[PDB]
Amino acid sequence: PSLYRVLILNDDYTPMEFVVYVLERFFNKSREDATRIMLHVHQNGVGVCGVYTYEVAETKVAQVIDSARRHQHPLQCTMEKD
């Protein structure tokens, strides 16, 4: 039954706007909440985008990666047990 948290890692190439876009897009964040998480990731090196069931966490990871790569950004996204 364990839920899984989705994490994005900081990097020195992915635009902030794209990270905000990603959080609004795939994690259902208002722009204000996205901005907060984006800045937290920038400062902490890692941040939680959300917590979901394993299957849903898995698709959100893939979707962020797919989106990032097609935008040609190196944005790293992964998950771990909540």
- Please name each of the domains of the chain with its CATH number: 1-82 (3.30.1390.10)
Q: In terms of Cα–Cα distance, which of 54, 55, 63, 69 is closest to 24?
A: 63
48 phi and psi angles, rounded to 5 deg: -85, 125
**36-60: b (≥16 Cβ within 10 Å) or e:** ebbeebeeeeebbbbebeeeebeeb
Angle, CA of 47, 73 and 6, to the nearest 5°: 25
**Neighbouring C-beta atoms of residue 30, cutoff 10 Å:** 10
Q: Measured between alpha carbons, how far is 81 from 68 in angstroms, rounded to an integer?
A: 23
Q: What CA–CA distance (Å, rounded) separates 34 from 26?
A: 11
C-alpha span between 33 and 49 (Å, rounded): 10
Give resolution in angstroms.
2.1
Closest CA to 24 of 37, 15, 13: 37
Strand segments (E) across 1-82: 4-9, 46-52, 76-81
Name the experimental technique.
Answer: X-ray
